[PDB]
Amino acid sequence: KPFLEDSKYQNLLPLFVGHNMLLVSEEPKVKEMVRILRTVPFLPLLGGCIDDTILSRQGFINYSKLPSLPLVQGELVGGLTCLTAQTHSLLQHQPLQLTTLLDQYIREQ
């Protein structure tokens, strides 16, 4: 109680009532944790924090599906430039559309 009163984590004081244990690691193997939890139905998860971000079980289940960080960082730029790419594609497809229709006419003949 005394630590949770004055720390980075303060909102877990209601969580920490009664008997409780903590899963601690250096790697965010959330999938493995939830996987071994599904084995025993009665056992509940109250949540906590992963990667210094406070969240419960309902958030942890959807988080369990996550690829490598650098490619998501690149996908951020990809999504930002998605609008520009869409404009370029909408501008460039119509000449390509005519060329592909001519090719399809060739194939039909």
Partner: peptide
């Protein structure tokens, strides 16, 4: 002339193109 036919397609505007490829689909 082969180049003239290509140039006609190249110089033709987008609005009339909406009449070009749609007619090709119909036929």
């Amino acid at each position: 002339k082969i180049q003239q036919l290509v140039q006609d397609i190249a110089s033709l505007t987008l609005l009339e193109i909406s009449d070009l490829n749609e007619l090709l689909k119909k036929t």
